[PDB]
Amino acid sequence: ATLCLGHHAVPNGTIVKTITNDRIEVTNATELVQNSSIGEICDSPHQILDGENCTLIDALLGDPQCDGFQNKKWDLFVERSKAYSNCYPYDVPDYASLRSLVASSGTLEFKNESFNWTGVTQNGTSSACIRGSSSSFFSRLNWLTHLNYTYPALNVTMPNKEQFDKLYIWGVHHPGTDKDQIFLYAQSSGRITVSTKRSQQAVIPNIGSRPRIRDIPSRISIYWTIVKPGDILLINSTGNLIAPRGYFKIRSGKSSIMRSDAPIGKCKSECITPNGSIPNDKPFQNVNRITYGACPRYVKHSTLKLATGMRNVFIENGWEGMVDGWYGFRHQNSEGRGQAADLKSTQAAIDQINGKLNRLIGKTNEKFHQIEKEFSEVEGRVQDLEKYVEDTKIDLWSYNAELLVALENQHTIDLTDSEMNKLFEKTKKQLRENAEDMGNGCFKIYHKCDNACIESIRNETYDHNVYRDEALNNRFQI
Amino acid sequence: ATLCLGHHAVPNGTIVKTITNDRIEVTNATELVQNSSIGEICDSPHQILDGENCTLIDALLGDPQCDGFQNKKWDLFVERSKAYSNCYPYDVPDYASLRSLVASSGTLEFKNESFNWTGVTQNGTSSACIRGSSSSFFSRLNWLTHLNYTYPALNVTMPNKEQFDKLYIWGVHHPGTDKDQIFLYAQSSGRITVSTKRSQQAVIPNIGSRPRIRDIPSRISIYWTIVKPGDILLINSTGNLIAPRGYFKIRSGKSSIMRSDAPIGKCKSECITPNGSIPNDKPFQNVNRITYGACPRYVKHSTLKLATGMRNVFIENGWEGMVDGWYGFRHQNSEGRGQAADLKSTQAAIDQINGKLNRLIGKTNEKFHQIEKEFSEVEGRVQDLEKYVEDTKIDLWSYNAELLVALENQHTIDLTDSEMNKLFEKTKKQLRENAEDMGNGCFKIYHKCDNACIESIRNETYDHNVYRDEALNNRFQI
Amino acid sequence: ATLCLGHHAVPNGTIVKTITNDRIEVTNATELVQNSSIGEICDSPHQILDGENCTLIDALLGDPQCDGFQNKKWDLFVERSKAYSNCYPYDVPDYASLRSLVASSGTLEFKNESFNWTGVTQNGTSSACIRGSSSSFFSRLNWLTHLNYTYPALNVTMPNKEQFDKLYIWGVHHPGTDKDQIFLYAQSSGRITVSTKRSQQAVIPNIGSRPRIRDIPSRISIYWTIVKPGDILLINSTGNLIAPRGYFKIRSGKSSIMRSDAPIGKCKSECITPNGSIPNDKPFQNVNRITYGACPRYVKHSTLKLATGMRNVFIENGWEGMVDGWYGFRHQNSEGRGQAADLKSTQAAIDQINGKLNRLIGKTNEKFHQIEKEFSEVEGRVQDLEKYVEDTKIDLWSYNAELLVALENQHTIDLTDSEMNKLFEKTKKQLRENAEDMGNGCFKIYHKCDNACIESIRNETYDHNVYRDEALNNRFQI
Ligand SMILES: *[C@@H]1O[C@H](CO)[C@@H](O[C@@H]2O[C@H](CO)[C@@H](O[C@@H]3O[C@H](CO)[C@@H](O)[C@H](O)[C@@H]3O)[C@H](O)[C@H]2NC(C)=O)[C@H](O)[C@H]1NC(C)=O
Ligand SMILES: *[C@@H]1O[C@H](CO)[C@@H](O[C@@H]2O[C@H](CO)[C@@H](O[C@@H]3O[C@H](CO)[C@@H](O)[C@H](O)[C@@H]3O)[C@H](O)[C@H]2NC(C)=O)[C@H](O)[C@H]1NC(C)=O
Ligand SMILES: *[C@@H]1O[C@H](CO)[C@@H](O[C@@H]2O[C@H](CO)[C@@H](O[C@@H]3O[C@H](CO)[C@@H](O)[C@H](O)[C@@H]3O)[C@H](O)[C@H]2NC(C)=O)[C@H](O)[C@H]1NC(C)=O
Ligand SMILES: *[C@@H]1O[C@H](CO)[C@@H](O[C@@H]2O[C@H](CO)[C@@H](O[C@@H]3O[C@H](CO)[C@@H](O)[C@H](O)[C@@H]3O)[C@H](O)[C@H]2NC(C)=O)[C@H](O)[C@H]1NC(C)=O
Ligand SMILES: *[C@@H]1O[C@H](CO)[C@@H](O[C@@H]2O[C@H](CO)[C@@H](O[C@@H]3O[C@H](CO)[C@@H](O)[C@H](O)[C@@H]3O)[C@H](O)[C@H]2NC(C)=O)[C@H](O)[C@H]1NC(C)=O
Ligand SMILES: *[C@@H]1O[C@H](CO)[C@@H](O[C@@H]2O[C@H](CO)[C@@H](O[C@@H]3O[C@H](CO)[C@@H](O)[C@H](O)[C@@H]3O)[C@H](O)[C@H]2NC(C)=O)[C@H](O)[C@H]1NC(C)=O
Ligand SMILES: *[C@@H]1O[C@H](CO)[C@@H](O[C@@H]2O[C@H](CO)[C@@H](O)[C@H](O)[C@H]2NC(C)=O)[C@H](O)[C@H]1NC(C)=O
Ligand SMILES: *[C@@H]1O[C@H](CO)[C@@H](O[C@@H]2O[C@H](CO)[C@@H](O)[C@H](O)[C@H]2NC(C)=O)[C@H](O)[C@H]1NC(C)=O
Ligand SMILES: *[C@@H]1O[C@H](CO)[C@@H](O[C@@H]2O[C@H](CO)[C@@H](O)[C@H](O)[C@H]2NC(C)=O)[C@H](O)[C@H]1NC(C)=O
Ligand SMILES: *[C@@H]1O[C@H](CO)[C@@H](O)[C@H](O)[C@H]1NC(C)=O
Ligand SMILES: *[C@@H]1O[C@H](CO)[C@@H](O)[C@H](O)[C@H]1NC(C)=O
Ligand SMILES: *[C@@H]1O[C@H](CO)[C@@H](O)[C@H](O)[C@H]1NC(C)=O
Ligand SMILES: *[C@@H]1O[C@H](CO)[C@@H](O)[C@H](O)[C@H]1NC(C)=O
Ligand SMILES: *[C@@H]1O[C@H](CO)[C@@H](O)[C@H](O)[C@H]1NC(C)=O
Ligand SMILES: *[C@@H]1O[C@H](CO)[C@@H](O)[C@H](O)[C@H]1NC(C)=O
Ligand SMILES: *[C@@H]1O[C@H](CO)[C@@H](O)[C@H](O)[C@H]1NC(C)=O
Ligand SMILES: *[C@@H]1O[C@H](CO)[C@@H](O)[C@H](O)[C@H]1NC(C)=O
Ligand SMILES: *[C@@H]1O[C@H](CO)[C@@H](O)[C@H](O)[C@H]1NC(C)=O
Ligand SMILES: *[C@@H]1O[C@H](CO)[C@@H](O)[C@H](O)[C@H]1NC(C)=O
Ligand SMILES: *[C@@H]1O[C@H](CO)[C@@H](O)[C@H](O)[C@H]1NC(C)=O
Ligand SMILES: *[C@@H]1O[C@H](CO)[C@@H](O)[C@H](O)[C@H]1NC(C)=O
Ligand SMILES: *[C@@H]1O[C@H](CO)[C@@H](O)[C@H](O)[C@H]1NC(C)=O
Ligand SMILES: *[C@@H]1O[C@H](CO)[C@@H](O)[C@H](O)[C@H]1NC(C)=O
Ligand SMILES: *[C@@H]1O[C@H](CO)[C@@H](O)[C@H](O)[C@H]1NC(C)=O
Ligand SMILES: *[C@@H]1O[C@H](CO)[C@@H](O)[C@H](O)[C@H]1NC(C)=O
Ligand SMILES: *[C@@H]1O[C@H](CO)[C@@H](O)[C@H](O)[C@H]1NC(C)=O
Ligand SMILES: *[C@@H]1O[C@H](CO)[C@@H](O)[C@H](O)[C@H]1NC(C)=O
Ligand SMILES: *[C@@H]1O[C@H](CO)[C@@H](O)[C@H](O)[C@H]1NC(C)=O
Ligand SMILES: *[C@@H]1O[C@H](CO)[C@@H](O)[C@H](O)[C@H]1NC(C)=O
Ligand SMILES: *[C@@H]1O[C@H](CO)[C@@H](O)[C@H](O)[C@H]1NC(C)=O
C-alpha cells in the first residue's frame, strides 16, 4: 500500500514580498495599507464644529457672518477653504500661533467683564462690518475713541481672582492718515502698553496709507496676552486702543483644527483625515499626512501584502482538490483510493497565523494637535524645519513598514512549511519499521494494509509491532 | 537497553513575548527596562552645582541671595523649583535662549573691565536688593544715572584682543513714569544702541506704569551681545543704560541645566535624570524623557522581558530533576538506571545566549544639552514643534525596542531547541545500526548494553561495529 | 565505495558580523558604507554655479565683484568659505531666511520696473563700492536722496499683473549721525512703510555711530516682501529709503546652497556632498551629513560588512580545492578517486544571495534644500532644535543599518547551510536502501559501484532497485 502526505493548493493565488525572494506566490494574503477614504467626515464620536465661511480667528474676534459661533466647543474645528472675512481690514502678527493657542482649547467660551472706562467714547463703529443692516465693527472688541475732543490716559486694572488662565484679545488702530489720527483720537499720536507681573507688551500706531480693503486704507492689528490666576491685567493707553470686552477661557485637551473641503455626514469613525474618515483597522494608511484621532501610520508605500496562506503549488505538487484542511493524507490500497485532511496540523498553522494578524491589525495610536504640515506661504527657517521633521518621520515609518512585512512574510512561509515536515516525520515514526520513504513525500507500506489501518495511521493509533514480521518478509525477504 | 535524551525544566518559569506566540513560558529571563530611580542625584563623576533659590540667570546677573555662585563651573546645573528672585523687578526677552547660551558654557567666570565713564553717576542703586543690610541693586551691572543734572552722550569702546568670545550683559531701564525719567536721567527720554562689526541692537525705554513687584512699578530689561576676537564693542547711549561691568567667557562643552527637586548625595552614576540617578546598565528606561550623561533610551513600555532560558516543560516532558546542565541523558539497563548532563551542548547554548546579552547590556549613549521637554507656559509654534519632535522620537525608539525583543526571544527559543535536536541526531549516528528511534526522543538499543557502553555512547567513543551482529540477530532475527 | 558531500573553502576569508555570533569568518563579503569621496565636485547632471568670493545674497543684492552672477540659474549654488563683500557695510535681519528663500528658487533672474519717482535724487552713490574705477553703491538698489534740499513723501504703487510671485528687495539707511541725516535727506528723521493687501512692514532709521567698516560708520539694512498676483505693492516713505529697481522671480524647485571648499571638475555623479561627489551605489555613507541629490543614508558606523559567501572551513572541513562550484561531491571507488561540483545547489545559493544584494544596492533617495546642519554662531533655541532633530535622525538610521546587516548576515549563513543539508538529504534518498550514513557527511555504498554509477547518483538517475540484492547481502548478510 502507499500513503502520501501533502498540502492544499490554489488555482489562482496572490503575490507577496519576502525578505529573501522579493516576489513569491502564496495561497492567501491580507492588505495592510488603507488607500481609500470615505469622502465624508463622521460626526461621531468626535464633536465637529463646521466653520462655514469663518476661520477660527474670525469666530474668536467676532464677525457678523460668524455670529453663530459663540461659546461653541469642539474636539475638531473644520476650517473651509472658501472662508473669507467680511469686516474691517484685519492683520494679526503671528496669527498662526494665536490660531494654535485657541485651537487646542477646544472653545470659544467668552465672559464679558466690567472694565471701568470714563472719558472716552465706549462704542467706536465701522461701516465695514454690517450687522442688522448697520455699522457694527467686531463683536468682542471695543473701539474706544475720543469723547468731547479729548482722550484721557486710560489706566485700568482687571485682577484675575478665578482659577482660569484668562485670554485677553486687544488691538491697535492704524488709521491710515494724520487727518484721522486727529479726528478720531484728538491727538497727533498715541501709545499702548499692556502688562502683567510676568510680562509686558507695547505698540505704537503707524500712520500712513495701505492698499484699500473693502474701501478702507486703515487697519486693525491684534495682540493677545494671558493672565495667570493671582495676577492682574493692567492697561495703560493714550489712544488708538481697541479694548477687550472680557476674556476667553483657556482649556487644554484633545482638540485641533483641520483644513478641509468635505461634507460632514452621519457615520462613526475614530480616524479623521481632510478628505473624509478612514476605517480604523489596517495599521498603515497612505491617504494623508494630516490626521486627527486614532489613525494608521502614514507611509509612502502604495501597498503592503501580508501572507496569511502558504506557498502555492520533496513533497509533491500541492493538491488543488484538498478542501477540508491545509495538510493531509492521500492513499492507495487494495481497496482503492481516498483522502482526508489532518486537522491537527491544519489548525496549528491557522492559529499561529491569526495570532500574528491579531498582533498588528486594529492597533493604532491616538494623536491630537499636530504641527502644521501644509503651507500657503513661504516663511523661511521655521517652515523649513517643520517640513524637514515631517519628511524624516515618514521615511522612518515607511522603512519600518516594509521591513516588518518582509520579515512577517518570510516567517509565514517557513512557518507553514515546517508543519508539513512535522507531519511527515510523525507519520514516519508510526511506520518506523514497516515502511520506506520513497523520496517524494510518500511512504511505501510493506504490509497489505486495508482502509482500517490507514485510518489508524492517520489518527496515530497504529501498532508497528503487529505487522513487523509481514513487513520484514516483504522488504528483506527474511 | 534504553537511552533517552531530554532537557531540564523549571517548576515555576516566567513569561516572555515572542514575535509568533505573544505569550510563552520560559525557564529564565532578564528585564531590559530600568523602571526605578534612586531618588537621589550622584555628585560623581559629573560636577553638580546646586542652585538653591537661584535660577541660572540670577547667578549670571548677580543677586544678593546668589552671591555664592560666582566664577563657578559645572557640568550640570540644578535649578530648584522653589527658586525666586530677591531683587529689582526683572524681565529678559527670550530669556530661554539666554539660559541655553550660558548653560552650555558650564561657567559663570567673570572678568571686570575698565569701561572709561565720565559725566554720569557710576553707582545707581536700589532698595529692592538688600545686601549687607543696604541698597545694592545687582552685582554685575552698573546703573548709570545723571550726574550734576546732566547725562552726556556716552560713546565708549571696548576692543576684544583676547582669544575668547566675550559675552556682555547689559540692559535698559523702564522707570515707570515721566516723573522719574526726569529725576533719574534729567531727560524726557533716552536711547540705547549697542554694536559690533557683525551686528547691531537698539532699544527705546518705554514710559508707563506696571503692576508693582516688591513695591516697584519700574522694571529692568536685559539684552546681550557677543563680541568675537578682533572685533570691538561700541556702546552709544543717551540715557537709561544699565551698563556691563565686564564680560563672561564663552566656552563650549558637555554641560546643561536640569530642573529638579531631589537631594544631591554621595554615590556614583553616569546617568542623571530629574528624580535621581539611574543605573547605567539596562538598554532602556521608562523613568523620564529628561536625561543627562550616558543613559538608556526612553521608551513607553512598562516592561520588556528577554529570555535567557529555553521553553519550559517529540522529546518528552522536560526533566525537572536535571540539575547539572541543560541537555542530557537518561538511561535504563540491566544494571538499573541513571542520568548525566551533556556538557558540550549545554555550554554551547549558554555561550550563544550570553553573547546576545553582552551585545545589548551596558551599551548606552552619552548626550548633553538637549532641548527643553517640559513647559510651564503656552508659547505657540516653536513649542508645538519641540513637543512634536520629542514625541516622534519616542514612538520610534519604543517601536524598535519592542521589535528587537520579540525577535531576540524568538531567536532564543529556536536557538535552544536546535541544540536538543543536534544532540539527538548525533546520538543516533553513534548507534547507526544498533538502535531504533522510538519516536519519543528515546533509542532502543539492541545489544545488552551495560553501564560502561552507556558512558561510551555519552562521550562519543562507542563502536557500532562490535555490537553489529548481536543487534542484527535481535532486530531482524538473522 | 564511498561518496562524500561537502562544500568549498577559502584559505583566507573575511569577517562579518551576525546577530548571534558577533564575529564570524565567511568566504565572501561586500561593504555597505561609502567612506571615501572623490575630493572634486561633478558638474553633471546637476547645474552648479560656483560663487567665487560671493555669497548668494551678494549676488542678489548686486556687488561689483559679483557682476558675473546676474540672471543665473542653478540647481546647486556653491558658496566658498573665502567669500567676503566688497561694498557699503551691509546688515540683513534674518538673512538666513532670505538666503533660504532665494536659494530654493534656483535663480537670480531680475526684471527692472518703472517706479515713477519725482522730487528725489534717483541715483545715490558711494565710494565704498568701486566699479569701473568709480563710486557705484549696489546694482539692484536705488539710493534715493533729497533733491533741491527737499524729500517729498514718496507714495508710489506698483501692481502685480503677472502670474509670478514677485520678490522685492529694499532697505533703510542708517547714516550714523545727525549731521548726515540732515545733509543727505534734509530732515531730522524719516520713516519707511511698505505694504500689500496681505501684510505690512515698517522701519525707523536709527541714528548713531557704529564701528567703521571699510572706513564707513553708517550701514544699510535690508528687508524684503513678496507680492502675490492680483495684489499691489505700495511704498510710503519720507526718507532713508533705498528703493528696489524691480523684482526677482520666485520659483520653486530642486535646488539649494552648499558651503564647500572643493574644485568643480569634469565627472558625473548623482550625489554631491561638500568635499566632492560620492558614488551613488552603496546604501550608506559616512562622509557627511550635508548632501544634495540622490545619496546613501548617513550613518555613524565606520563599516558594515555583508556576507555574500558562506561560513568558512557534521559535514567535514570545507574543501579548499573545490573550484567549480560551492557544493559538491567527492568519491572513492575501485577505480580510484575524483570530484565534481553540484551546480544545481550552487546556483540556488548564488541567486538567493544576488537577490538580496540587488534589493539593497543602488537604492537611494533624492533630497533637496535640507535644513542647515553646521553653524558658525551661537543662536539660542532655534539652533538647538535644529541640532537636536539632526542627531535624532542619524541615530535612528544608524540603528537600522546595524540591525539590517546583522539580520542579513545571519540569514545568509543559514541560507547557505540549508543548501548543504538539502543536497545531503537528496543523495540519501537516491541511495535509500543501498547505503549507510557514516555520520561525517559521507555515505557508505554497499554495492561495488564504478565511476559510471557515481555519475548516475550525482545526476539523480540512479536506480536503487538494481543493486538492492547486492547491498542486502553485504550489509545484513542475507
Ligand atoms: C498711563 O495712564 C496714567 C494715568 O492716567 C498716565 O499718567 C498720567 O498721564 C497724563 C498724560 O500724560 C499726565 O498728564 C500730563 O500732565 C503734565 C503736567 O501737567 C502735562 O504737562 C502733560 O501735558 C499732561 O497733561 C498725568 O500727569 C499723568 N499722571 C496721573 C497719574 O494722572 C500715564 O502717563 C499713562 N501712560 C502712558 C501709556 O503714557
Ligand atoms: C497712495 O497711493 C495709493 C494708490 O494710488 C492711494 O490709494 C488709492 O487712492 C485712490 C484715490 O486717490 C482711491 O480711489 C478712490 O477709490 C474709492 C473707492 O475705494 C472711490 O470711491 C473714489 O472715488 C476713488 O476712485 C483708490 O481706491 C485707492 N486704492 C488703491 C490702492 O488704488 C493712496 O490713497 C495714496 N495715499 C496717500 C495719497 O497718502
Ligand atoms: C552717541 O555718542 C556720541 C558722542 O557723545 C553722540 O554724538 C554727540 O551727541 C550729542 C548729543 O546729541 C551732540 O550734542 C548736540 O549738539 C547739538 C549742536 O550744538 C545740539 O543742538 C544738541 O542739543 C546737542 O547738544 C553732539 O554734537 C554729538 N557729537 C559729538 C561727537 O560730540 C551721539 O549723538 C550719540 N548717539 C546717540 C545714541 O544719540
Ligand atoms: C495704574 O493703576 C494701578 C492700579 O490701581 C496703580 O498701581 C497701584 O497704585 C496704588 C496707588 O494708587 C498702589 O497703592 C500703594 O501701594 C504702596 C505699596 O506698594 C503703599 O505703600 C501705598 O500706601 C499705596 O497703598 C498699589 O500698590 C499699586 N499697585 C497695584 C498694581 O495695585 C498704578 O500706580 C496706576 N498708574 C498710574 C496712576 O499711572
Ligand atoms: C506717504 O505719502 C503720502 C503722499 O505723499 C503722505 O501724505 C502727505 O504727506 C505730507 C508730509 O507729511 C503732508 O504734507 C504735510 O502737510 C501739512 C499741512 O499743510 C503740514 O503741516 C506738514 O508739515 C506737511 O507739509 C501731506 O499733507 C500729506 N497728504 C498728501 C496726500 O499730500 C503720507 O504722509 C506719507 N506717509 C508717511 C510714511 O508719513
Ligand atoms: C565713538 O567712538 C568710536 C571709537 O573711538 C569712534 O570711531 C572711530 O572714530 C575715529 C575718529 O575719532 C576714527 O579715526 C579715523 O579713522 C579714519 C579712517 O577710518 C582716518 O582717516 C581718520 O584720520 C581717523 O584716524 C576711527 O577709525 C573710528 N573707528 C573706530 C571704531 O575706531 C566713533 O566715531 C565715535 N562716535 C561718535 C564720536 O559719535
Ligand atoms: C459663503 O459666502 C458666500 C458669499 O456671501 C455665499 O454665497 C452666497 O450665497 C447666498 C445664499 O446663501 C446667495 O444668495 C448669494 O448670491 C451667494 N453669493 C455668491 C454668488 O457668492 C455662500 O453661500 C457662503 N457659504 C457658506 C454659508 O458657508
Ligand atoms: C529659600 O528662601 C526661603 C525664603 O527666604 C528660605 O526660607 C527661610 O529659611 C530661613 C532659614 O534659612 C528661615 O529663617 C526663614 O524663616 C525661612 N522663611 C520662610 C518661612 O520662607 C529657604 O530656606 C531658602 N532655601 C534655600 C536656602 O534654598
Ligand atoms: C578673491 O578675492 C581676493 C582678494 O581680492 C583675490 O586675491 C587677489 O587675486 C588677484 C588675482 O586675481 C591678485 O592680483 C591679488 O593680489 C590678490 N589679492 C590678495 C593677495 O588677496 C582672489 O583671487 C579672489 N578669488 C576669487 C576670484 O574667487
Ligand atoms: C483567503 O482565503 C479565504 C478562505 O479561507 C477566502 O475567503 C479569501 O477570499 C481568501 N483571500 C484571498 C485574497 O485570496
Ligand atoms: C486600495 O485601492 C484599490 C483599488 O481601488 C482597492 O481595491 C482597495 O480596496 C483599496 N484599499 C483600501 C481598503 O483602502
Ligand atoms: C454681559 O452681557 C450680558 C448680555 O445679556 C449682559 O446681561 C451683562 O450685563 C453683561 N455683563 C457685563 C459685565 O457687561
Ligand atoms: C469707575 O471710575 C469712576 C472714576 O470717576 C468712579 O467714580 C466709579 O466709582 C468707578 N466705578 C464704577 C461705577 O465702575
Ligand atoms: C455701548 O453699546 C452697548 C450696547 O449693548 C452698551 O451695552 C454699552 O454700555 C455702550 N457703551 C457706552 C457707554 O458707550
Ligand atoms: C485624499 O487625501 C489627499 C488630500 O487630502 C489626496 O492624496 C487625495 O485627494 C485623496 N486620496 C488619496 C489618493 O490619498
Ligand atoms: C483511529 O482509527 C482506527 C481505525 O481502524 C480506530 O480503530 C481507532 O479506534 C481510532 N482511534 C481514535 C483516536 O479514535
Ligand atoms: C535564572 O537562572 C539563574 C540560575 O542560573 C537563577 O539564579 C536566576 O534567579 C534565574 N532567573 C529567573 C528570573 O528565573
Ligand atoms: C521595576 O519595578 C518593579 C516593581 O517595583 C521592580 O521589582 C523592578 O526591580 C523594577 N525594575 C528596575 C530594575 O528598575
Ligand atoms: C576688578 O575687581 C577687583 C576686586 O578685587 C579689583 O581689585 C580690580 O581692580 C577690578 N578691576 C577692574 C578692571 O575694575
Ligand atoms: C578716560 O576719558 C577721559 C575723558 O576726559 C580722559 O581724560 C582719560 O584720559 C581717559 N582715561 C582713563 C583715565 O580711563
Ligand atoms: C562705585 O562703587 C564701587 C565700589 O566698589 C567703586 O569701585 C567704583 O569705582 C564706584 N564708581 C563710581 C566712580 O561711582
Ligand atoms: C521619576 O520620574 C518622573 C518625574 O521626573 C515621574 O514619572 C516619577 O515621579 C518618577 N518615576 C517614574 C515612575 O518614572
Ligand atoms: C568514554 O567513556 C568510556 C566508558 O566505558 C571510556 O572507556 C572511554 O575511555 C571514555 N572516553 C573518553 C573520551 O574519555
Ligand atoms: C568574492 O569572491 C569573488 C569570486 O567569486 C572574488 O573575485 C572577490 O574578490 C571576493 N571578495 C572578497 C572580498 O573576498
Ligand atoms: C573606505 O576606506 C578604506 C581604507 O582607505 C578603503 O579601502 C575603502 O575602499 C573605502 N570604502 C569606500 C569604497 O569608500
Ligand atoms: C531695464 O534695463 C535695460 C538695460 O538694457 C533698459 O534697456 C530698459 O529700458 C530698462 N527698463 C526699465 C523698466 O527701466
Ligand atoms: C509720473 O508722475 C508724474 C507726477 O507729476 C506725472 O506727471 C507723470 O505723468 C507720471 N508718469 C510717468 C512719466 O512715469
Ligand atoms: C540714474 O542713472 C541711471 C544710469 O543707467 C539712469 O538710467 C537713471 O535714469 C538715472 N536716474 C535718475 C533720473 O537719476
Ligand atoms: C569629507 O567630509 C567631511 C568634511 O565635509 C570630513 O569628515 C572629511 O574632511 C572628509 N572625509 C570623511 C572622513 O568623511
Ligand atoms: C547521468 O549520468 C549517467 C552516467 O552513467 C548517465 O548514464 C545518464 O544518462 C546521465 N543522465 C543525464 C541526466 O544525462
Author numbering:
A (entry chain A), B (entry chain C), C (entry chain B): 25 to 337, 352 to 516
From the paper:
Hemagglutinin (HA), the most abundant glycoprotein on the surface of influenza viruses, serves as the primary antigenic target for neutralizing antibodies. HA is a trimeric glycoprotein with each monomer composed of a globular head containing a vestigial esterase subdomain in its lower portion, and a stem domain17. Each subunit consists of a membrane-distal polypeptide (HA1) and a membrane-proximal polypeptide (HA2). The HA1 subunit is comprised of a globular domain (residues 116–261) formed by an eight-stranded antiparallel β-sheet motif that includes a distal shallow pocket corresponding to the receptor-binding site, surrounded by the five immunodominant epitopes (A-E).
To better understand the complex relationship between glycan organization on the HA surface and its potential impact on emerging strains, we characterized the structures and glycosylation profile of both HK/68 and Sing/16 by cryo-EM and mass-spectrometry. Notably, we obtained a structure of a fully glycosylated Sing/16 at 3.9 Å-resolution. We also solved the cryo-EM structure of Sing/16 produced in GnTI- cells, at 3.7Å-resolution and Sing/16 produced in HEK293T, at 3.9 Å-resolution. The two structures are highly similar with a Cα-root-mean-square deviation (rmsd) of 0.77 Å, suggesting the distribution of glycan types does not have a significant impact on the folded structure. The structure of Sing/16 revealed the prototypic trimeric structure of HA. The HA plasmids contain either one or two N-terminal superfolder green fluorescent protein (sfGFP) domains, for HK/68 and Sing/16, respectively. We observe density for core N-acetylglucosamine (GlcNac) moieties in our cryo-EM reconstructions at all PNGS on both HK/68 and Sing/16 except at N122, which is within a well-resolved region of the protein, and N8, which is near the N-terminus and is part of a poorly ordered region of the protein. Of the glycans detected, however, we found that HK/68 possessed on average 67% complex, 15% hybrid, and 16% high-mannose type glycans, while Sing/16 possessed 49% complex, 9% hybrid, and 28% high-mannose. We found that the accumulation of glycans on HA’s head domain has a dramatic effect on the epitope accessibility in the region, with an average 4.7-fold increase in GEF for Sing/16 over HK/68 for head domain residues. Our EMPEM analyses revealed that the fragment antigen binding domains (Fabs) of polyclonal antibodies complexed with matching proteins targeted the HA head in HK/68, head and vestigial esterase domain in NL/03, and vestigial esterase and stem domains in Sing/16.
